[PDB]
Amino acid sequence: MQEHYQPAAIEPAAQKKWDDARISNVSEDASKPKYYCLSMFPYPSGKLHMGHVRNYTIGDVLSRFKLLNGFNVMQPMGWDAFGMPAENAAMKNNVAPAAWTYDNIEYMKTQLKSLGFAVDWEREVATCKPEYYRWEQWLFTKLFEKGIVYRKNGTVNWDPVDQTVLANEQVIDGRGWRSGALIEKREIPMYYFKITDYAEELLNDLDKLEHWPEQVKTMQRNWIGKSRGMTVRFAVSDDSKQGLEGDYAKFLQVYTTRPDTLMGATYVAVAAEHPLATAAAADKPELQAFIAECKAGSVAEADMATMEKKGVPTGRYVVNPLNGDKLEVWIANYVLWGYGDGAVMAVPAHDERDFEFAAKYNLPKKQVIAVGDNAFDANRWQEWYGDKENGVLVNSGDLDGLDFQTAFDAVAAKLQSQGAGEPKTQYRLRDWGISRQRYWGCPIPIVHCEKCGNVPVPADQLPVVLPENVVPDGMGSPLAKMPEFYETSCPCCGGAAKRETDTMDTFIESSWYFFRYMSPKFSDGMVSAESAKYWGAVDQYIGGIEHAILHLLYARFFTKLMRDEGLVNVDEPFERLLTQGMVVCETYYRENDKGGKDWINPADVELTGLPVVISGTEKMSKSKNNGVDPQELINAYGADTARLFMMFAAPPEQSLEWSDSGVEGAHRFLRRLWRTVYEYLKQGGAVKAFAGNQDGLSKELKDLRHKLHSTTAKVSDDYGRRQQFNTAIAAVMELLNQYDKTDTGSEQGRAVAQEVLEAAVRLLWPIVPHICETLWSELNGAKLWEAGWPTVDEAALVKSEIITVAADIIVVPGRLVNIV
Ligand SMILES: CC(C)C[C@H](N)C(=O)NS(=O)(=O)OC[C@H]1O[C@@H](n2ccc(N)nc2=O)[C@H](O)[C@@H]1O
Ligand SMILES: [Mg+2]
Ligand SMILES: [Zn+2]
Numbered sequence: 001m002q003e004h005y006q007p008a009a010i011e012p013a014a015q016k017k018w019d020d021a022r023i024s025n026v027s028e029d030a031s032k033p034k035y036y037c038l039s040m041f042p043y044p045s046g047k048l049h050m051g052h053v054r055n056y057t058i059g060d061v062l063s064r065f066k067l068l069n070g071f072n073v074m075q076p077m078g079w080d081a082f083g084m085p086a087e088n089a090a091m092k093n094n095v096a097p098a099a100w101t102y103d104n105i106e107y108m109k110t111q112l113k114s115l116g117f118a119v120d121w122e123r124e125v126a127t128c129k130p131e132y133y134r135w136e137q138w139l140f141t142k143l144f145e146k147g148i149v150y151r152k153n154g155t156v157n158w159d160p161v162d163q164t165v166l167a168n169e170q171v172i173d174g175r176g177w178r179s180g181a182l183i184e185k186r187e188i189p190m191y192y193f194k195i196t197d198y199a200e201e202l203l204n205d206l207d208k209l210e211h212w213p214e215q216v217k218t219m220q221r222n223w224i225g226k227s228r229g230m231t232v233r234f235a236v237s238d239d240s241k242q243g244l245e246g247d248y249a250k251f252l253q254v255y256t257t258r259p260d261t262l263m264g265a266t267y268v269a270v271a272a273e274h275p276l277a278t279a280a281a282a283d284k285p286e287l288q289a290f291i292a293e294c295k296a297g298s299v300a301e302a303d304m305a306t307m308e309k310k311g312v313p314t315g316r317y318v319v320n321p322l323n324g325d326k327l328e329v330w331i332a333n334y335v336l337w338g339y340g341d342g343a344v345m346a347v348p349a350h351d352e353r354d355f356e357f358a359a360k361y362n363l364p365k366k367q368v369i370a371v372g373d374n375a376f377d378a379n380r381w382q383e384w385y386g387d388k389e390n391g392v393l394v395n396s397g398d399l400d401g402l403d404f405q406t407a408f409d410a411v412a413a414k415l416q417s418q419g420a421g422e423p424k425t426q427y428r429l430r431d432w433g434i435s436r437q438r439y440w441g442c443p444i445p446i447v448h449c450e451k452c453g454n455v456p457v458p459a460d461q462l463p464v465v466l467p468e469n470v471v472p473d474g475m476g477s478p479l480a481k482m483p484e485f486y487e488t489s490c491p492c493c494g495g496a497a498k499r500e501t502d503t504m505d506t507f508i509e510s511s512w513y514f515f516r517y518m519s520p521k522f523s524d525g526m527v528s529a530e531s532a533k534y535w536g537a538v539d540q541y542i543g544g545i546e547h548a549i550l551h552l553l554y555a556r557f558f559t560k561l562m563r564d565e566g567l568v569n570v571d572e573p574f575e576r577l578l579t580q581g582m583v584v585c586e587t588y589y590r591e592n593d594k595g596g597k598d599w600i601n602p603a604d605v606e607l608t609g610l611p612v613v614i615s616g617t618e619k620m621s622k623s624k625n626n627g628v629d630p631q632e633l634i635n636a637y638g639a640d641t642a643r644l645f646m647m648f649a650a651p652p653e654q655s656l657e658w659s660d661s662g663v664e665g666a667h668r669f670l671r672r673l674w675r676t677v678y679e680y681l682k683q684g685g686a687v688k689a690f691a692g693n694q695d696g697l698s699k700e701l702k703d704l705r706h707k708l709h710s711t712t713a714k715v716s717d718d719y720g721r722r723q724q725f726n727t728a729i730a731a732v733m734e735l736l737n738q739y740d741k742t743d744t745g746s747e748q749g750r751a752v753a754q755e756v757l758e759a760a761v762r763l764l765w766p767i768v769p770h771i772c773e774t775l776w777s778e779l780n781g782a783k784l785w786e787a788g789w790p791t792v793d794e795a796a797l798v799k800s801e802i803i804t805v806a807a808d809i810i811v812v813p814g815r816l817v818n819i820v
Contacts, residue, residue: 001681001778005674007638011770015116018773023067023785024075024118028534032072036535037063038514038574040543040551044079044104044126048111050620051544051583053630054646054656058580058725059542060117061647064766065719067118068789074535075118076517078125079105082133082441082506087472090440097440098468101128111631115639116770125520127509132516133442134463135526136508139558141445141456142565148194151446151454154433157298158184163475165437168300183298190435190502191444195557199224199427202556211576216548223549225428230259230412232345232421234268234318236276237326243279252276252318252329255340255426258388259415260407262322263396264347264368266358269311269332271342277331280314287312287331294333309334309357321420322411323397332357340426355381370394432554434505439470439477441503449490449497458491464499477501510551511558514538514573525567532568541574548579578652578723585658587615587624599625603632607660617657628658640768641667647725647767669733670771673764676736677775680753683745686779689758690751694795701752704742705796708756711735712790715763725767732763754779759790 002009018024039059042052056077063075079101086097093100105126112119125132143149157166161179170177195202203224206217233251241249252268270276272294281287290312299307311332318327327345334353335344348358348365358365359379367376369391371384384390388404399407415421435444443464445457457464467485470478479485479501490497518531552574559573588600590612600612620627633642645666650656694705711731718728735756744753758779765772765784776784799807802814810818 001678003678005671005771007640007670007770010774011114011116011639014770014773015113018116018118018769024073024120025122026072026074026120028531029072030534032070034535035063035066035071035073035540036538037066037073037075037540038517038538038542039075039077040541040547041078041080041510041513042108043083043085044081044101044108045085046104046107048108048630049583050628050630050633050646050658051580053115053642054583055542055544055580056112056115056117057643057646058578058652059540060643061719061725061766062540062542062723063118064769065789068762068765068785070788073118074120074123074517076123076125077112077117077119077121078123078513078517078520079108079127080506080510080513081105081126081128082503082509084438084440087438087440090472091474094471096468096471098128098470101440102126111634114634115643118769123517123520125513125516127513128440128466130463130465131523132520133466133509135516136442136504136512137445137457137462137464138459139512139526139561139565140504141459141462143193143561144446144456148197148561149191149434150194151189151191153187154190154192154435155185155187156190156437158186160184164477168298171298174296174298185295188435190433191446193432193434193557195432195553196427196429198557198560199226199429201560202553205556205571208572209575209577212574213577213579216545216552216577216579219549220553223429223553226425227257227427228423228425229255229257230408230415230421231255231341231424232259232262232321232415234320234327234345235420237317237319240276240316240318240329243282244275248275248279252343253341254343254345255424256345258347258350259411259421260393260399260402260404261347261350261368262320262345262411263393263399264349264366265320265325265327265345266348266364266366267330268318268327268343268345269330269335270314271335271337272331272333273337274331274335274342276314276316276329276343280316280329280331284315287314290331290333294331297333304334307333309353309360311357311361321415321418339428349376349378350385352381352386355385366395368393368396432505432557434508435502436505437477438503439472439479440466441506442466442508443479444500444502444504446500447488447490447497448500449493449495451495452490452492452497454500455490455492455497461491466503477503479503507551507554511554512562514555515559515562515568526562527567529567537570537572538574540576540578542578542580544582545579552577580652581650581655582619583656583658584617585620585626585628586617587626588612589615589624601625602628602658619655620658633663637663637667638770640670640770644670644729644768648729649726651724651726670768672736673760673771673775676739677757677761677778680757681778684750687750687754689755689780690748691755691793697748697752700742701744701749702796702800704738704744704752704756705793706799707735707738708759709793709796712759712763713792716789716792719766729764729767732760735760758787762787762790 037059039056059075063073067073081101086101089100090097127133140149157171159166159176159179159181161181162176166176171183174182176183203221203226206220209217231253233253235251236249272291277291281291311330314329314331316329318329320327335342346354348354348363349367350369365378371387371391374384391404393399393402393407399410402410412423443466445462445464446454447457448454472478486499486501488497488499515527518535519528522528555573562568585602588605589597590600592598605612641663645663646656648666649662694702714731715728718724739756744750761772761775773784810820
């Protein structure tokens with residue numbers, strides 16, 4: 001054992017020792033309890049980020065903890081490899097996205113290996129390989145036959161300068177993000193998953209997930225957005241039927257979740273595309289213009305409520321079926337065609353959006369709900385205006401006095417008795433559109449034939465291979481310009497036919513990769529039956545909150561689809577979910593000649609030519625050029641320091657501030673750990689660790705054993721139960737502090753010192769395995785992973801007794817107890 005801690009010496013040896021042992025290469029071992037720990041696999045975009053290292057260290061702590069506890073742990077890693085970045089690099093550097101993707105995969109793989117993650121690299125998948133994506137093409141074809149996947153026209157944002165389709169997130173005031181040209185809205189046929197057939201299932205099964213953070217579950221419920229409401233029909237007034245045809249000339253139909261307030265309706269609102277808007281706009285240019293601007297909008301869902309609500313009166317009227325009052329129809333920009341009837345009623349007194357809209361336009365507000373003795377002011381919204389549970393009806397004639405549910409059913413009955421309405425269940429959830437007009441993605445296994453239609457590719461013929469010898473240009477997705485790809489024969493009649501050239505939403509790869517890891521070389525299905533039965537579901541999933549809605553929903557959806565096909569036998573893919581925090585860092589800048597700021601990367605500054613300006617701390621990103629390269633942290637200090645800093649700086653959910661002093665402190669503590677073992681061995685070598693009856697130990701050594709087995713209990717509860725790793729590390733530091741202040745020089749003192757150190761290096765092994773593996777080998781000759789996780793010695797927690805009273809009519813505890 002050298003005197004000085006040199007991580008570049010020991011970290012490669014430990015990694016080779018673990019790999020030669022095949023500790024992380026696992027099989028379907030029925031004689032060991034399985035544990036599947038999974039971190040959200042990365043985009044291979046070149047280099048690991050510091051947040052990558054935080055995520056995968058967290059995964060590795062939990063994985064190593066269960067390993068030391070005797071679990072057969074699978075911790076797989078792979079590459080979410082399709083997507084836009086490789087096409088961007090291919091337009092920048094003039095290389096093939098596949099060449100760029102694979103070179104990044106190899107580099108990032110070395111990075112992960114140098115960090116010592118206990119990963120089964122024999123289960124590695126790369127989603128851009130045909131061996132992977134053939135199976136999602138296969139699932140596509142099966143669902144297409146059942147109609148769960150279907151084709152229908154949708155509207156897209158066509159950028160006419162860049163010559164490709166843009167998401168709403170890439171449209172800024174109607175203009176493409178890069179080009180700057182006005183977007184065109186175009187209707188093209190695309191493919192959809194009928195995820196709405198699974199709405200109630202995906203909502204209800206959320207209640208099974210007792211170990212999910214409740215905010216993730218709440219976000220999923222709000223996204224599915226089930227509600228139980230009422231269809232209500234408002235008869236069109238005789239004076240308003242001009243230009244209307246069909247049922248639109250008879251009535252305006254609306255959906256509402258608050259039919260108990262229908263006596264409170266003071267106007268109604270329709271979508272820009274509603275027939276009443278069309279009929280009203282026919283002789284009114286201002287309505288025509290209002291409709292045009294609504295159609296030309298690109299309000300993304302995540303911004304829908306941040307949009308300013310606007311409308312225009314149409315001059316048409318409808319009749320409330322309950323009280324007969326005539327309501328003017330307004331066209332409103334917040335009423336969305338395709339969500340239900342594309343038309344709503346408005347009750348300004350008991351709906352905040354209606355309150356704000358009515359206040360802007362001085363539309364009337366009519367109270368029909370009362371709560372307690374609260375004051376109703378028609379000018380100031382109050383939160384009790386929208387209370388359902390604790391409200392009573394007023395100004396509603398027959399319905400006065402009723403609560404929410406009873407008035408609901410009474411309104412239902414009144415409407416049904418007139419044939420003017422009926423109860424109705426709705427979902428905000430939209431079907432999942434998966435067509436992308438992109439090259440670097442999984443081809444859609446459909447062939448178009450003029451006689452046979454859209455036909456799925458036979459399974460015998462899958463994969464439809466994406467040709468990798470392609471360099472995107474900047475004038476359409478290449479596939480549409482490659483007859484060598486799309487020209488083919490019809491698999492049903494053999495005639496002249498064309499392959500679909502759109503590719504799949506890349507969320508699709510990430511919706512089932514956790515099952516592929518169970519048998520990533522299985523050539524006869526998505527996942528082998530024997531492996532799916534053994535591994536079951538993911539026990540622990542770790543990933544960022546940015547994937548808590550879409551990706552998790554899609555993964556849960558795919559799991560039920562695969563279950564329904566008989567490929568798996570679980571309802572839910574992920575049992576426990578941990579959301580790790582972002583990583584932040586200072587920013588630096590220097591003003592430029594044009595009155596702006598040029599952002600300086602922290603690696604290119606000298607702290608304390610001419611200096612730059614220190615600025616505000618935010619998430620590491622290419623936005624303000626403030627990303628700290630994890631590889632430089634590894635080269636300077638070793639993987640163990642990097643791992644420790646990230647786990648000590650902050651609890652997992654909290655954002656982690658980059659800290660140069662924090663890194664140095666992490667390294668100093670690893671130095672201290674090394675010196676403590678070295679000095680313990682330099683005095684008189686290793687001994688058998690203390691065990692058994694501790695009667696006759698001195699108080700000082702009993703107190704060290706108390707602190708020791710207390711620390712083991714604390715750290716076990718922190719790894720397993722609370723998943724708070726920073727407090728586990730400080731608890732081991734406190735143990736070493738007490739050891740430092742204990743004379744352990746006697747025969748019994750050495751035996752207790754051995755016990756302390758053998759436990760400490762095992763307790764820290766999931767955090768810093770390279771140095772602990774090395775120190776454990778100097779202290780004990782058994783395999784660390786065979787010694788296993790430290791066990792708590794309950795006797796070491798028994799305090800000495802002191803009638804006689806244990807350490808847990810006057811009466812003073814521990815001096816007397818005057819019976820008076
Ligand atoms: C399951 C699929 C949909 C995952 C998808 N490939 C993805 O997000 N890939 S990824 O490469 O973007 O990130 C992988 C993981 O690492 C975290 N990360 C990353 C970078 C960073 N600077 N800080 C972080 O915390 C990020 O939140 C995520 O949990
Ligand atoms: Mg349960
Ligand atoms: Zn045909």
